Design a protein around this ligand. Structure first.
Ligand SMILES: Nc1ncnc2c1ncn2[C@@H]1O[C@H](COP(=O)(O)OP(=O)(O)O)[C@@H](O)[C@H]1O
Lengths: 600, 457, 49, 410, 250
């Protein structure tokens, strides 16, 4: 059955009696069961790229073919797990070995056997029932927040021959058996999928609902859609944690995945230490986010293949959760460090350098990865929708976007939340540079906003214009001083500063800004822009008059409104009811209208 | 005559390397014949013989080599090159990259089979394209005009509205019946729906065929995707006299598949690692255009390509530049200022405009207006570059008029509504009402006769 | 004295700002494009090798 | 007869080249002349105009026959030639006749099989050498030697040979060298004496538009004439887009005897033209750091006559009836007037700047704006409508108008 | 004289023999027949390209730009075949000529040549475009033996000192010529304006020869002093005060 090692050169192991192998088939090499992928066939001989250090592999050692290409086990026990990029459970490789290392030659199963879970068979089914890929034949109650929907593997189909009754079961139990063309297939709560193959769908849909982060600058000026593709310039000086933590600890996304592409060893342990301590409110309970995630963490020294696979394991886990009818969201901490793993594997394959050193396929690997996002109709019969949102951080050298991974990423992603070291040095958290940043999903949210927030598109448009006008006016302020500007320009600059400091900026450590709902966000901006339009009305309406209104007169006779506008951030969704917040914001609208009427 | 001889099928896979599978013991291999591969699990794939040598056939597999096996893989050699079933029945339909149907309609009934490579149009039979198409877009019809059967690409920086521009051409283009072939390579689904939806919004869908290859479809299928489109365009144009327009979308995402195949084969690299044959491969796409004697058909090509890092001198635009009848440029410097369509006239040219304009095609003044608009726009950019260093105090009154020209020109001549159609005559009158900013004698590109007939109005 | 200073400053400031803008929009752009070109052609030699 | 295309057709002697290859373009024929029997290259990026120069030579030159060689070129080019050349006409002995009678096309369009690009170039020159042996002053448009070099790259790649720069074979420089040097003016073989010639013009197409290109780098080591085209001129639609700083012709020392015999005034004018056109760029590098107020009146006059020579002499819209062609008499008449204005304007300043009554460029422009407009108008004179004596008489009136105006300023 | 001709249309490989053949004729005439021989090689680049062509066809490991890695030793077996020998009067002077590819002095052909040849004479596009014939850029031009060929009885005794001063003046001239743009003509001192005047007058008189003017070394040093006379005596820091007192007040 299995082959034998014939030669080794660095990480590349040639084998013989590999006649029945396939290219990219997964193989165990050596008495220690080292992992590797076939990268050439030469007849009955095959060349295996080994992942771990080959030191001590011997000619004539066993070479067990795995019946699969590189693949992810999917099922119960994903939640709260920490995997590496080739789907090995780092929490269990710790606790089972009692060692601080990943031993060379791990053979621990990725979803831990013998751990029973409460399984409910779908009570609508019977023996002889017809079933297809993506049908939810049962649920596992593995955690209170996330009912794990089991489903028939996408390639499988047939008639139910037996289903397990309600009870406690694990990966070794034959939960389902079905027959097709006279052949029975046995199945388990564990499913397996090729990591480089997309999980198919009934239909990929146009994305049309906001991935609300609870962060004003993001949710208002640069909305990412659920299922959207987006990038963050992940660099130490700009606070990349602020977005990624806020997405996890609040945002409207049923399950989170986080992929360590290849992070610095300490910065990776920072994340793995810190995330378990985060909690989110559900059903008026407080609970650890480890109920709603799995972490695929690779430090820079994990094997080259484990770094380049990292995002493909991540997306595959994320698509499995998408096909349960969840709005999944997935971070990638540095697509640049994944792109280095591409450069290295192509270097070992001796493939020609394309752009700057990277492979020819870097753009295609990025693009065929990002296309795995979106909202979808799931496979199978219960008709559910789900999504995967991809938040791919990039790390351009010196901020230079001409960098191939960064350039191709900005080519493919529809949103860029351009964090900036300048704003972070000024403590302007969330420190998103609104001039550089953009979203291509504005059109796609028109349908949503027209229903729920029909005034908001006007408000967003005015807000960006007001901020852009202040950036142009600042050149005139440098040339000729603030005193030289027109009254309309001065009030625009003052309001743009108010928008910048009391709407874009948000202190996520405070109880009032730890999260910020969308209705709160709209109401705050509505007041600032209603004030702008009425202030500007009084100024322009008193063009050519004997007494002309100016920002200083507005501050003198109604600076209480400016103070109130700045104060609107303090309103608390816990201590204040939604109606109470809306009423206070409506009261500030009435207050400012009467104050403006005292001038014009 | 039909190929009657029964097909062979080989298990003699004897190597696999990158996208290649190497057969052995093959009986008289044919270069470029197509092979169907059955994988061990019963999955079907297809591939072209790239080299032959005695008993060996090197097959490149379109659908990728992952899962190919040295014992169980079965290669059905078809015995001929990659023919495609073609028919006029392909209008109002949608196809995957390799020309399989994806509109849920049936397999195409062949009115004939054609070789995907086409044939070299005989230079003696080729007719020099001169009948103008109005696209309706002033930056085209005024200064970069397109002839019926021209090939002329739209170059863009990434994220620019080049899709909307191509959509507008497929909403407004017509002569002073018409049918569209559309192909897209490595397109994202968020844009595939935009193109499909736009042909519905324009009502055009019944007269158009979309070949779609998306960014997560196989990269090697992009090599044949535009060739299928052109083969259908040849059938519609040269066999059926249709006035075909071919849209090829992101030739860059096609060119990346060439670079991949090149690196995988170890071909001699030109600039940025594209294969040495990059110019020829692009010609084998871009030359299937223009009228041919006795046939009323006229394949027009408007390729579209995202220039990498916005660099005009990059091999993709640059080699396309040598082949195409001039080029249309779309620019961030216009798009950031919301100047739709963001077509920068200055770097643009149309090689065929020279004969597509003047009496019998367009108004007599048109050629002179175009040149003088380039002169004033260019001088406007030069005085703008002067002002940006030395200030308006260094500029003469005439230099400030060239700066004002550039401002008034971009706000009126280039700026146009996404659904606004402007005739060439209206574009020329906008041209003249801008040219009237200078005194008559300053218009140094225009002859005195043209000035006397068209300046004073 | 204030006027002689004013006139001299108004010329000297214009001269200085013109040199600064020539550095910012002529000399630095030539250097940057030259460096990007050098990096490109070095990588072309590296790919040939 | 049948001849191996790779073997040079021999000659009694290869002589020096000493008669201008008359070309419709002012800038070419005046400032960088080609010669019957000489080689030339036209390196230019895409859309620079090199193909229109190649057309213009073929349409309008003193070449007795033209072989045009569409090696790897876009197909509509061959259609445009076959459309235009049966309809355009020269005249012999009082009979008007279609110029196609004096041409042949070798075509191999860009999509035709790569290898045939080599056979095409060798066919075009071997035909040219055949007509050379008849005593015709042949010209041959090698309409892209870079697309030829790319065909040698292809065969080398398939052969797995070791590439030189950018993948090109090491023998590329040797193939190009042994090709352009098939040109010459020759004592033919055999007994009735003939002086045939081949003149070779190669439209090099540098990948990325950069003259560091190996095809260009080899070609410039071989050719005696360089007409380097600038994409920035082509962007401005300045055509033909010849960069006058980098372009050169080695034949000037031989041709100076012909100009001495027929156009004795010309060598001074050609020299002053090249110098003014260099002094413009010397001034530009200063002006861009300080502004135009730094210029002396001599410098303003320099930039103005440089603008005349650039926009009204070097510029030529070769499809229009008036720029279709330009006889040498029209060409020298235009340049003579422009340089006569330079010398007279310069003299007027130099004569008066020694005093408070100083003439300036602005004084000249305000007194002589009509003369600047007349000088710009000179290009519009049409050889079909206007005789050489008529054009020369108009130009003499411009010289007199300038002289009488300057006599009123001094 | 004796001319070996290989024209561009003669076969590539013959060019490998051609310079070695000529040098063998030179060694026969000089070292066996006492002749003073001048050897001119017209383009070592078209020779280096011939080694490249055959080396490429041999699948040899390349040096930079795909030339054979042995290019240095190969060029040495050509260039080193020169100079007088013991007991002979005969002597070979070599002036090889070398088409710098793409105008690049650092290209491997001129680069490796500069390591072997005892200096170089550099002919420059910039000077040619300025109509300076011959276009010899004196700055990158160098001659390793020159210091031993000059002094009393060999030349006028000033020669070494005049050359060093003139060379440094031309270099400062090119620097102040760049300053005329970068900081402006108005920022030039009277001394910088004298280096600019020197630069102009030097190219017009020192470099510009005409095709037949056979200037003596003595006439060249007279012209050298006539240019040095532009500066005040105290500016001439490269010349000893004895040499100045003998030859500056002329
Ligand atoms: N001499 C010219 N006169 C007028 N227009 C020109 C001239 N040269 C270039 N142009 C315009 O620019 C186009 C591009 O130049 P062309 O020679 O045809 O392309 P290419 O440089 O790629 O070979 C010309 O076809 C013509 O339309």
């Amino acid at each position: 059955t299995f082959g034998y090692v014939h030669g080794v050169s660095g990480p590349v192991v040639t084998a013989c009696d590999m006649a029945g192998a396939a290219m990219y088939e997964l193989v165990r090499v050596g008495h220690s069961e080292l992992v590797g992928e076939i990268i050439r066939l030469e007849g009955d001989m095959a060349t295996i790229q080994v992942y771990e250090e080959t030191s001590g592999v011997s000619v004539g050692d066993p070479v067990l073919r795995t019946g699969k290409p590189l693949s992810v086990e999917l099922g119960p026990g994903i939640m709260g797990a920490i995997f590496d990029g080739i789907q090995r459970p780092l929490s269990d490789i710790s606790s089972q070995t009692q060692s601080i290392y990943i031993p060379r030659g791990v053979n621990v199963s990725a979803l831990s056997r013998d751990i029973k879970w409460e399984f409910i068979p779908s009570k609508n089914l019977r023996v002889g029932s017809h079933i297809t890929g993506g049908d939810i034949y049962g649920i596992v109650n593995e955690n209170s927040l996330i009912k794990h929907k089991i489903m028939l593997p996408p390639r499988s189909r047939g008639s139910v021959t037996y289903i397990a009754p309600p009870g406690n079961y694990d990966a070794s139990d034959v939960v389902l058996e079905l027959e097709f063309e006279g052949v029975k297939e046995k199945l388990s709560m564990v499913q397996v999928w090729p990591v480089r193959q997309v999980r198919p769908v009934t239909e990929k849909l146009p994305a049309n609902h906001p991935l609300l982060t609870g962060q004003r600058v993001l949710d208002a000026l640069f909305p990412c859609v659920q299922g959207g593709t987006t990038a963050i310039p992940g660099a130490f000086g700009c606070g990349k944690t602020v977005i990624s933590q806020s997405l996890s600890k609040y945002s409207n996304s049923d399950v989170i995945i986080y992929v360590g592409c290849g992070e610095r060893g300490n910065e990776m342990s920072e994340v793995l230490r810190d995330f378990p301590e985060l909690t989110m409110e559900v059903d008026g309970k407080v609970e650890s986010i480890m109920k709603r995630t799995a972490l695929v963490a690779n430090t820079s020294n994990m094997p080259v293949a484990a770094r380049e696979a990292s995002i493909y394991t991540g997306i595959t886990l994320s698509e499995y959760f998408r096909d349960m009818g969840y709005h999944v969201s997935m971070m990638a901490d540095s697509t640049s460090r994944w792109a280095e793993a591409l450069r290295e594997i192509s270097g070992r394959l001796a493939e020609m350098p394309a752009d700057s050193g990277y492979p020819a396929y870097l753009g295609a690997r990025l693009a065929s990865f990002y296309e795995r996002a979106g909202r979808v109709k799931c496979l199978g019969n219960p008709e559910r929708e789900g999504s995967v949102s991809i938040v791919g951080a990039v790390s351009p050298p010196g901020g230079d976007f001409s960098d191939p991974v960064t350039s191709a990423t900005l080519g493919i992603v529809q949103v860029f939340w351009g964090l900036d070291k300048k704003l972070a040095q000024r403590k302007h958290f969330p420190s998103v540079n609104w001039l550089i940043s953009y979203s291509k999903y504005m059109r796609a949210l028109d349908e949503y906003y027209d229903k729920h927030f029909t005034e908001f598109v006007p408000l967003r448009t005015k807000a960006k214009e007001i901020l852009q006008e202040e950036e142009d006016l600042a050149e005139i302020v440098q040339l000729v001083g603030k005193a030289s500007l027109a009254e309309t320009d001065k009030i625009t600059l003052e309001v743009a500063k108010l928008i910048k400091d009391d709407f874009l900026q948000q202190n996520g450590y405070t109880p009032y800004d730890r999260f910020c709902p969308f209705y709160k966000t709209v109401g705050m901006l509505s007041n600032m822009i209603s004030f702008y339009d009425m202030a500007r009305r009084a100024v322009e309406t008193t063009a050519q008059s004997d007494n002309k209104i100016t920002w200083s007169i507005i501050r003198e006779h109604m600076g209480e409104i400016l103070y109130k506008l700045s104060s609107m951030k303090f309103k608390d969704p816990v201590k204040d009811g939604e109606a109470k917040i809306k009423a206070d914001y409506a009261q500030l609208l009435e207050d400012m209208q009467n104050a403006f009427r005292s001038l014009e | 005559n039909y190929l009657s001889q029964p097909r062979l099928t080989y298990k003699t896979v004897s190597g696999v390397n990158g996208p290649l599978v190497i057969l052995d013991h093959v009986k008289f291999p044919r270069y470029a014949e197509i092979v169907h591969l059955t994988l061990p699990d019963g999955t079907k794939r297809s591939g072209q013989v790239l080299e032959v040598s005695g008993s060996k056939a090197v097959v490149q597999v379109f659908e990728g080599t992952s899962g190919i096996d040295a014992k169980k893989t079965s290669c059905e050699f078809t015995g001929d090159i990659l023919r495609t079933p073609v028919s006029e029945d392909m209008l109002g339909r949608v196809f995957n990259g390799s020309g399989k149907p994806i509109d849920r309609g049936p397999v195409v009934l062949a009115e004939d089979f054609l070789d995907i490579m086409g044939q070299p149009i005989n230079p003696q039979c080729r007719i020099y394209p001169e009948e103008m198409i109005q696209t309706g877009i002033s930056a085209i019809d005024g200064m970069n005009s397109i002839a019926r059967g021209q090939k002329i690409p739209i170059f863009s920086a990434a994220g620019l509205p080049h899709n909307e521009i191509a959509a507008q051409i497929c909403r407004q283009a017509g002569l002073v019946n018409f049918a569209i072939v559309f192909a897209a390579m490595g397109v994202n689904m968020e844009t595939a729906r935009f193109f499909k939806s736009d042909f519905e919004e324009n009502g055009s869908m019944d007269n158009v065929c979309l070949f779609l290859n998306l960014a997560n479809d196989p990269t090697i299928e992009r090599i044949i995707t535009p060739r299928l489109a052109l083969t259908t365009a040849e059938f519609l144009a040269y066999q059926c006299e249709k006035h075909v327009l071919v849209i090829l979308t992101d030739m860059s995402s096609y060119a990346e598949a060439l670079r991949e195949v090149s690196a995988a084969r170890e071909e001699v690299p030109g600039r940025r690692g594209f294969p040495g044959y990059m110019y020829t491969d692009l010609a084998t796409i871009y030359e299937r255009a223009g009228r041919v004697e006795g046939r009323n058909g006229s394949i027009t090509q408007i390729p579209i390509l995202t220039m990498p890092n916005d660099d005009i001198t990059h091999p993709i635009p640059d080699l396309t530049g040598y082949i195409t009848e001039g080029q249309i440029y779309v620019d961030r410097q216009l798009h950031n200022r919301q100047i739709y369509p963001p077509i920068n006239v200055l770097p643009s040219l149309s090689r065929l405009m020279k004969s597509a304009i003047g009496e019998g095609m367009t108004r007599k003044d048109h050629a002179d207006v175009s040149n003088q608009l380039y002169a004033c726009y260019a001088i406007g950019k030069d005085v703008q570059a002067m002002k940006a260093v030395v200030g308006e105090e260094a500029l003469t009154s005439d230099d400030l008029l060239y700066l004002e020209f550039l401002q008034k020109f971009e706000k009126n001549f280039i700026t146009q509504g996404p659904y606004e159609n402007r005739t060439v005559y209206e574009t020329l009158d906008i041209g003249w009402q801008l040219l009237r900013i200078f005194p008559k004698e300053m218009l140094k590109r225009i002859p005195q006769s043209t000035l006397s007939e068209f300046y004073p109005r | 004295s204030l006027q002689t200073s004013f006139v001299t400053l108004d010329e000297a400031i214009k001269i200085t700002n013109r040199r600064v803008n020539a550095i910012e929009h002529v000399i630095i752009p030539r250097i940057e494009r030259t460096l990007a070109y050098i990096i490109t052609e070095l990588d072309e030699r590296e790919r040939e090798e």
